[PDB]
């Protein structure tokens, strides 16, 4: 996260850290959507261009964290993966279309003051809040500057941007399963996600029932916090049907 700030305790109880067994390192962010399922970006697990292809036994899940490098004894919870599910039509070859993946934990996690699941949007909520100008919140332990890393979870609030503007800021072919967010050059404020934040949740707070909903997933960008450029996120609602399918069948 660039131009963000330290999160307060319990601010994002659904934030998940994808941790590599060996070598032990931060791999990606993710989000807790229930006591047995974790949502993240597909490119965190599969991306041939970089020879990236992880399996269940290469990773660990760390929930309830605040500090990036410390083993938060009695606070965080480390879980193992039972099975991974990459969207069947994940386009890693061209534009990262449908950059989403579900992960099944071996054992259910117990909720606490620091561990709690985020909500998934329904048609109505997506419709009401997914509008340009409306701000969302992104969290991660990623780079603070374009390339130097944070000591603790970072957070930043960013406005959704009109589809046309998003399309005109890049050569990459944009699809309906994406949206971009960030401030325009003439808006004074700034901020963005960056390498290391991948798979992180883009959340909004519903003014109707006061709940937090995950609308996006940190998918891709071109540079970090550059003028005229915006962060792209996987449009979670569009892929909601796939999500439900996997969960109802496994």
């Amino acid at each position: 996260i660039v131009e963000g700030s330290d999160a307060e305790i319990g601010m994002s109880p659904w934030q998940v850290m994808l941790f590599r067994k060996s070598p032990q390192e931060l791999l990606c962010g993710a989000s807790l959507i229930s006591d047995r399922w974790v949502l993240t970006a597909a490119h965190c697990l599969l991306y041939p261009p970089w020879d990236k292809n992880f399996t269940e036994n290469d990773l660990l899940v760390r929930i309830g964290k605040h500090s990036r490098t410390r083993y938060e004894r009695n606070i965080e919870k480390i879980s193992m993966l039972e099975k991974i599910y990459i969207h069947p039509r994940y386009n890693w070859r061209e534009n990262l279309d449908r950059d989403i993946a579900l992960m099944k934990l071996k054992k259910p996690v117990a909720f606490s003051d620091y561990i709690h699941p985020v909500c998934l949007p329904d048609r109505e909520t997506a419709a009401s809040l997914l509008q340009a100008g409306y701000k969302g919140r992104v969290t991660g332990w990623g780079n603070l500057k374009e390339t130097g890393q944070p000591s603790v979870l970072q957070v930043v609030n960013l406005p959704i941007v009109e589809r046309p503007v998003c399309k005109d800021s890049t050569r990459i072919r944009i699809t309906d399963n994406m949206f971009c967010a960030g401030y325009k050059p003439d808006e004074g404020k700034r901020g963005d996600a960056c390498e290391g934040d991948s798979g992180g949740p883009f959340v909004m707070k519903s003014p109707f029932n006061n709940r937090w909903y995950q609308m996006g997933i940190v998918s891709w960008g071109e540079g970090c916090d550059r003028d005229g450029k915006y962060g792209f996120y996987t449009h979670v609602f569009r892929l909601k049907k796939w999500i439900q399918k996997v969960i109802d069948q496994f």
Partner: peptide, 10 residues
């Protein structure tokens, strides 16, 4: 990073 307890690896 800080080494995490070993009983999580296995």
């Amino acid at each position: 990073y800080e080494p995490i307890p070993e009983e999580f690896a296995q």
